Amino acid sequence: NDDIDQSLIIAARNIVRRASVSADPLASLLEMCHSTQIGGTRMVDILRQNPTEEQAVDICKAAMGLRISSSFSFGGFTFKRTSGSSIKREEEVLTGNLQTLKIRVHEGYEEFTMVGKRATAILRKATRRLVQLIVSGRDEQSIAEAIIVAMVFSQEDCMIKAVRGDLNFVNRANQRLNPMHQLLRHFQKDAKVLFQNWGIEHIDNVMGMVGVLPDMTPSTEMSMRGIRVSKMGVSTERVVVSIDRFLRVRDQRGNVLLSPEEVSETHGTERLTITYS
Ligand SMILES: O=C(O)[C@H]1[C@H]2CC[C@H](CC2)[C@@H]1Nc1nc(-c2c[nH]c3ncc(F)cc23)ncc1F
Ligand SMILES: O=C(O)[C@H]1[C@H]2CC[C@H](CC2)[C@@H]1Nc1nc(-c2c[nH]c3ncc(F)cc23)ncc1F
Ligand code: NI
């Protein structure tokens, strides 16, 4: 049970990475899934029975019409909506380097939990606004990673304005990343202009919680607008999802739940033998 899961993830990640470089990735992935065995059992038979929710694995499940977790993955983090709703409106925005970006802006009030491996968070947000972020983590590194993802996800104008120079990030297949991911890789290379330009505010010490400044220094006095660090940020609903040619998994409203771009780069050595085509 434990070894099949470890091995299935490794096989799924390899398949999505190989498929993603092909002209029609969906068809490539479907080939490899149907002609791959893990410890002697067929991979499609493992997918039908195994309950693991992982980004590469869930892309493969979707590919063959299996139900998956309704969560979505942004910046490595799993997001579950705990409350509220939104609608979608495409808008042109202008970066700090005067580059147009067409963005599907979400309009509404929504509350989510973010769960990464080294940090978790509660996010509350409105139309192009971070309302509040309560974040936990292992360290300075891991906490800042979660803050950058929440800031980009919020769609705020100060985040858009803090962009410096052009955004032409590409995937392994030489195709441009879509705008939200363009923004995310930019601020993942450097979040300094982002944090400086975000804004600061006075806070009252709720015990358990602390402020954090644009240089990541804690404080009891001030914090970055909306953001508080904490010490412990507190089950699966399977649903039908869709898949396209480029392995983008979507909900019924067309929000991208998963993609090649949200599959972890970790190479790892399988515990049960994996035989490909
Ligand atoms: O995909 C498979 O491995 C099996 C299982 C899971 C999907 C189908 C239903 C059973 C598929 N069944 C069959 N596939 C195929 C088959 C040939 N090339 C393929 N490439 C991708 C694929 F996906 C299925 C196939 N041929 C006869 C079948 F009878
Ligand atoms: O809009 C999309 O197609 C994708 C890409 C950009 C961010 C998410 C992950 C990739 C997004 N997916 C999803 N977003 C959302 C979503 C709700 N409110 C939001 N506000 C801003 C935002 F940015 C995304 C959202 N819900 C479910 C999703 F599944
Ligand atoms: Ni994207």
Tab-separated table of N, CA and C in Angstrom, residues 74 93 100-104 152 160 167 176-185:
chain	number	residue	atom	x	y	z
A	74	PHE	N	-1.965	25.548	-7.129
A	74	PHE	CA	-1.288	26.749	-7.599
A	74	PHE	C	-0.038	26.954	-6.761
A	93	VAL	N	-4.971	43.724	-18.067
A	93	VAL	CA	-4.208	44.541	-17.089
A	93	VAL	C	-2.867	44.966	-17.702
A	100	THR	N	0.639	44.341	-21.478
A	100	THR	CA	-0.719	43.884	-21.302
A	100	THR	C	-0.812	42.416	-20.866
A	101	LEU	N	-1.755	42.103	-19.991
A	101	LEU	CA	-2.025	40.703	-19.660
A	101	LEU	C	-3.525	40.569	-19.624
A	102	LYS	N	-4.046	39.523	-20.274
A	102	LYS	CA	-5.451	39.189	-20.201
A	102	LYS	C	-5.604	38.184	-19.078
A	103	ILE	N	-6.428	38.524	-18.092
A	103	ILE	CA	-6.580	37.721	-16.884
A	103	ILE	C	-8.048	37.398	-16.661
A	104	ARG	N	-8.333	36.166	-16.248
A	104	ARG	CA	-9.688	35.827	-15.829
A	104	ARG	C	-9.803	36.207	-14.355
A	152	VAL	N	-0.197	36.633	-5.546
A	152	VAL	CA	-0.447	36.503	-6.970
A	152	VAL	C	-1.903	36.071	-7.178
A	160	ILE	N	0.367	43.360	-9.616
A	160	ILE	CA	0.541	43.560	-11.069
A	160	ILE	C	1.536	44.699	-11.377
A	167	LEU	N	7.562	39.523	-19.192
A	167	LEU	CA	7.227	38.158	-18.815
A	167	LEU	C	7.079	37.309	-20.095
A	176	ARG	N	4.202	29.424	-24.323
A	176	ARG	CA	4.212	30.438	-23.254
A	176	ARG	C	3.341	29.977	-22.100
A	177	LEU	N	3.794	30.199	-20.870
A	177	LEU	CA	2.940	30.003	-19.705
A	177	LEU	C	1.824	31.038	-19.740
A	178	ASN	N	0.632	30.639	-19.282
A	178	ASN	CA	-0.503	31.551	-19.163
A	178	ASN	C	-0.283	32.599	-18.027
A	179	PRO	N	-0.924	33.782	-18.130
A	179	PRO	CA	-0.630	34.977	-17.322
A	179	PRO	C	-0.460	34.821	-15.810
A	180	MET	N	-1.315	34.040	-15.161
A	180	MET	CA	-1.215	33.878	-13.703
A	180	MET	C	0.107	33.191	-13.334
A	181	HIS	N	0.489	32.154	-14.083
A	181	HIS	CA	1.788	31.482	-13.893
A	181	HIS	C	3.003	32.329	-14.302
A	182	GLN	N	2.841	33.177	-15.318
A	182	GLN	CA	3.852	34.158	-15.703
A	182	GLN	C	4.196	35.034	-14.503
A	183	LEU	N	3.147	35.584	-13.890
A	183	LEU	CA	3.302	36.393	-12.702
A	183	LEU	C	3.986	35.604	-11.586
A	184	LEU	N	3.548	34.369	-11.364
A	184	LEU	CA	4.042	33.581	-10.242
A	184	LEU	C	5.549	33.252	-10.329
A	185	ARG	N	6.026	32.845	-11.510
A	185	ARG	CA	7.461	32.585	-11.712
A	185	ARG	C	8.293	33.849	-11.593
